[PDB]
Amino acid sequence: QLQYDKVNFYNEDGTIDNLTMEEYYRKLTGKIASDGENNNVVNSSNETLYN
Amino acid sequence: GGVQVGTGTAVESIVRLHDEYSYYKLKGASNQLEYTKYMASTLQEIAQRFP
Numbered sequence A: 001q002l003q004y005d006k007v008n009f010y011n012e013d014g015t016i017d018n019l020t021m022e023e024y025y026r027k028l029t030g031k032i033a034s035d036g037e038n039n040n041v042v043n044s045s046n047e048t049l050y051n
Numbered sequence B: 001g002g003v004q005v006g007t008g009t010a011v012e013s014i015v016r017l018h019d020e021y022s023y024y025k026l027k028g029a030s031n032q033l034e035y036t037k038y039m040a041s042t043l044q045e046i047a048q049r050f051p
Helices: A019-051 B021-046
Strands: none
Touching: none
16 A cells, blocks of 8 residues: 555655655656756757857 | 250159049948948857857
8 A cells, every 4th residue: 555655755845745756766867867958958059159 | 066965864753553532432342341241240140149
């Protein structure tokens, strides 16, 4: 049953945030990925510049 | 002595082909060319930001 259940984490924002660890992995990882391409789009924005 | 003695020819000049009317013809050409060329560089410089 716990495998279904959403449970709360005691986080740096002080939250007790009902959740599945899966989504935490999702939200943690997806956030990490977002940074990459966004920057490397900026690189593409930059390569409009430097060239 | 009743017979002709001619001093003949003497030589002096240092000059070149000219027209004052033309001189400012060239002046204006530079002036307007200067406007457009600088205009051009700044134009595309800004337009260059993004294709």
